[PDB]
Swiss-Prot record:
GO biological process: angiotensin-activated signaling pathway; carbon dioxide transport; morphogenesis of an epithelium; neuron cellular homeostasis; positive regulation of cellular pH reduction; positive regulation of dipeptide transmembrane transport; positive regulation of synaptic transmission, GABAergic; regulation of chloride transport
Result of changing residue 114 to Q: Strongly reduced activity and sulfonamide affinity
Residues of the site described as Fine-tunes the proton-transfer properties of H-64: 4, 59, 64
Cofactor(s) the protein needs: Zn(2+); Co(2+)
Miscellaneous comment as given in the Swiss-Prot or TrEMBL entry: Target of drugs used in treatments against glaucoma disorder and breast cancer.
Annotated consequence of substituting residue 61 to W: Impaired activity, rescued by 4-methylimidazole (4-MI). Impaired activity, not rescued by 4-methylimidazole (4-MI)
Pfam families hit by this protein: Carb_anhydrase
Transmembrane helix listed as a keyword: no
Assembly notes: Interacts with SLC4A4. Interaction with SLC4A7 regulates SLC4A7 transporter activity. Interacts with SLC26A6 isoform 4 (via C-terminus cytoplasmic domain).
UniProt family annotation: Belongs to the alpha-carbonic anhydrase family.
Domain Alpha-carbonic anhydrase: 1-256
Name under which the protein is recorded: Carbonic anhydrase 2
Sites where the protein binds substrate: 195-196
């Protein structure tokens, strides 16, 4: 099975998931000079006040903080989106070094990590149906650079010792995802895909211009996770990012000029 190693990493995924070579694959490089400012883009509406986190899970590729998505508690609307998308989970991708780790790049620049807040279009009833649809998901992507700590991330960092290995989960209630958001909600947007298998072309990507800063110690704790299950040989969970894919005939739009 697929992963991020030398024999099963991103360049291998197309053998099991042929859509890996598709027409709207993610991530991509965001060339900020070819991005098109679109005055008709609405501001993003992020309504996380009622969010209910439930638990945190090491799935062998990243860790997911999962939310109750059985009601409109934490929703994303506006921006390029029609209708309401519900937060189901967030996770991150990160590097072995501070100089790499993000999936999207900005003018070929790589950030230390990238946060994905995953939301599904409520008109499809649940996440499983939504991923089968071209407008099924909206993923809000936020870059992390290494600098000052992000206090709102610390509760995530502190529980990672409880989920070191693949398949481990821990109760993780009352986490407020608003503490992971940068000041500005200026964004780029383009149609794309999940960045891990099954690589389905179901995502409206919304990538924030402004990164959040996290401390070196915070991202180091990410790197102490393991891809392997307990009692298997230890392989650090680092470099769990897919590289940029061809833009093909897509234009990236910007909400700001
Ligand atoms: N990166 S993303 O484009 O925001 C994204 C958003 C929502 C997703 O459902 C996926 N993809 C998966 O969930 N794949 C199954 C899986 C992945 C990792 N480990 C175990 C199982 C990727
Ligand atoms: Zn992701």
């Amino acid at each position: 099975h697929w992963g991020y190693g030398k024999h099963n990493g991103p360049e291998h995924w197309h053998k099991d998931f042929p859509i890996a070579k598709g027409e709207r694959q993610s991530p991509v490089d965001i060339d900020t000079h070819t991005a098109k400012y679109d005055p008709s883009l609405k501001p993003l509406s992020v309504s996380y006040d009622q969010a209910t986190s439930l638990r945190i899970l090491n799935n062998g590729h990243a860790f997911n903080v999962e939310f109750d998505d059985s009601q409109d508690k934490a929703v994303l609307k506006g921006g390029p989106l029609d209708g309401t998308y519900r937060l189901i989970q967030f996770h991150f991708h990160w590097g072995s070094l501070d100089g790499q780790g993000s999936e999207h790049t900005v003018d070929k620049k790589k950030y230390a990590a990238e946060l994905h807040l995953v939301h599904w279009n409520t008109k499809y009833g649940d996440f499983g149906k939504a991923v089968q649809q071209p407008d099924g998901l909206a993923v809000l992507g936020i870059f992390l650079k290494v600098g000052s700590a992000k206090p709102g991330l610390q509760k995530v960092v502190d529980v990672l010792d409880s989920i070191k290995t693949k398949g481990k989960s821990a109760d993780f209630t009352n986490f407020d995802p608003r503490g992971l958001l940068p000041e500005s909600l200026d964004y780029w947007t383009y149609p794309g895909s999940l960045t891990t298998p099954p690589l389905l072309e179901c995502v409206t990507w919304i990538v924030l211009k402004e990164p959040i800063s996290v401390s070196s110690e915070q991202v180091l704790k990410f790197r102490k996770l393991n891809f392997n299950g307990e009692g298997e040989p230890e392989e650090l969970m680092v470099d769990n990012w897919r590289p940029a894919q061809p833009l093909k005939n897509r234009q990236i739009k910007a909400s700001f000029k």
